[PDB]
Amino acid sequence: GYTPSADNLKARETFQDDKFGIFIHWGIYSMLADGEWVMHNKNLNWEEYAKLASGFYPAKFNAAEWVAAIKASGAKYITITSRHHDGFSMYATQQSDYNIVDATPFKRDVIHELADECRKQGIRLHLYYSHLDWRRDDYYPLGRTGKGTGRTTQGKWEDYCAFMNNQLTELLTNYGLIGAIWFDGMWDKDIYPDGMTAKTWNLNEQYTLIHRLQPACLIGNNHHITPFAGEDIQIFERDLPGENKAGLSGQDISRLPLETCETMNGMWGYKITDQDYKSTKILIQYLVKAAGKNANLLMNVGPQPNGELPTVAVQRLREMGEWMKIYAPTIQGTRGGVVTPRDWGVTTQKGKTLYVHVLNLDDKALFLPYAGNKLKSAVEYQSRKSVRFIQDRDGILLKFTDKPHSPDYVLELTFANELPLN
Numbered sequence: 001g002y003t004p005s006a007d008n009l010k011a012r013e014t015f016q017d018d019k020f021g022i023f024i025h026w027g028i029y030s031m032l033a034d035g036e037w038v039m040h041n042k043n044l045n046w047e048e049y050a051k052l053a054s055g056f057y058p059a060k061f062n063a064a065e066w067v068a069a070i071k072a073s074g075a076k077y078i079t080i081t082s083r084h085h086d087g088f089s090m091y092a093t094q095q096s097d098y099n100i101v102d103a104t105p106f107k108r109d110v111i112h113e114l115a116d117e118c119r120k121q122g123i124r125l126h127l128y129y130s131h132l133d134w135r136r137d138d139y140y141p142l143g144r145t146g147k148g149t150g151r152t153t154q155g156k157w158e159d160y161c162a163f164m165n166n167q168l169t170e171l172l173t174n175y176g177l178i179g180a181i182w183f184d185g186m187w188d189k190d191i192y193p194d195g196m197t198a199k200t201w202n203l204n205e206q207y208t209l210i211h212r213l214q215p216a217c218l219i220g221n222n223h224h225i226t227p228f229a230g231e232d233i234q235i236f237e238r239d240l241p242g243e244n245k246a247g248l249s250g251q252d253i254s255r256l257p258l259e260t261c262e263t264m265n266g267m268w269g270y271k272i273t274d275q276d277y278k279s280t281k282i283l284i285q286y287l288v289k290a291a292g293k294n295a296n297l298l299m300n301v302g303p304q305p306n307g308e309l310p311t312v313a314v315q316r317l318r319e320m321g322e323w324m325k326i327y328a329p330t331i332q333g334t335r336g337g338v339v340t341p342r343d344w345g346v347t348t349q350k351g352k353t354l355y356v357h358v359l360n361l362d363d364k365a366l367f368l369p370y371a372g373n374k375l376k377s378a379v380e381y382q383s384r385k386s387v388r389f390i391q392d393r394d395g396i397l398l399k400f401t402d403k404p405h406s407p408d409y410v411l412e413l414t415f416a417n418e419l420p421l422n
């Protein structure tokens with residue numbers, strides 16, 4: 001079956017080292033400013049919806065400003081929508097004239113500009129690509145969604161698979177190195193009996209094509225189930241691995257590198273009525289919790305129809321970056337800690353070092369259930385002040401002089417041996 005290349009293994013380890021990326025959902029739906037699902041939610045006719053492209057002009061778009069504001073947060077990569085459910089391509093494809101260059105007065109390939117700036121600025125580029133299409137008539141038979149977009153013709157599914165293959169080829173050919181392909185949407189056909197099989201979705205052909213073009217490119221698929229052979233990362237939508245508070249998960253944690261995706265406000269695409277952006281404290285803690293469960297955090301912003309990133313999102317990214325300036329070594333380059341997440345916080349680890357991230361504790365002591373490795377020292381990460389501890393065969397007890405500050409009271413524990421990997 002699938003044995004991943006060595007460049008692919010390095011790519012997985014670098015991805016886990018990086019820990020933090022930014023999601024970008026941008027399209028012509030940003031004009032309606034009611035979320036990226038508006039075409040299906042309001043049952044918009046595909047022709048009338050497509051008429052919006054000839055008025056799309058994000059005049060204030062600036063790839064350099066975007067990538068700079070994201071880099072400033074500590075994030076190391078950007079995952080951007082190359083084509084979402086509405087079928088509109090945000091790059092210069094030759095498989096359809098329904099794209100940013102040919103169908104709008106903007107006439108610019110924004111994915112190419114962003115790739116150039118990511119190269120220049122040391123940020124890796126990941127591409128989201130939708131298996132689901134609400135406009136094309138060769139997406140036949142239909143799944144659960146999209147029955148109200150006014151399609152009145154049928155094509156062959158083979159033609160749609162060819163279309164996807166050629167678009168994937170283009171994206172892996174004209175834009176430099178691509179960190180990952182992020183498939184989404186096959187959950188649409190989970191109503192038919194064979195709706196989540198690799199053969200209906202042509203997954204083996206597609207994955208093999210991807211890895212032939214760029215063997216170090218990682219593949220993830222947001223299907224919410226057990227990863228298919230060929231995927232290089234596992235995705236959890238709006239939940240940490242092993243949690244299901246949002247109801248879109250519940251699948252077993254595989255052995256692939258893990259990534260949790262989340263929105264900074266409540267919606268992926270720009271939504272003018274949704275201005276409730278999570279606080280900087282919440283976002284820092286979300287990243288720390290992700291890292292403590294051995295997962296990356298892919299945090300989303302939805303660009304405005306004038307081309308700017310929301311100002312509040314840029315503020316949050318800058319404040320997260322101020323925090324990262326001090327604490328990134330306790331997150332980036334680490335893995336999930338030997339003590340798994342607890343109500344008080346989490347732990348990350350690197351070599352012989354265990355970082356204890358105390359996120360939610362008002363007592364002045366903390367029990368760590370870990371034994372068999374001589375603890376040789378404990379200090380506060382920032383101040384370097386020493387932390388009193390008692391170690392025995394049952395575990396470790398840390399005692400604090402003050403009881404802890406927000407948003408993260410971090411202790412650095414140094415052990416004699418190891419730290420293990422479960």
Ligand SMILES: C[C@@H]1O[C@H](O)[C@@H](O)[C@H](O)[C@@H]1O
Binds near residue numbers: 036
């Ligand atoms: C990937 C994100 O979660 C879901 O899968 C999608 O339906 C959303 O539009 C968004 O792209």
Ligand SMILES: [Cl-]
Binds near residue numbers: 291292331348349
């Ligand atoms: Cl980690």
Ligand SMILES: [Zn+2]
Binds near residue numbers: 112
């Ligand atoms: Zn170029």
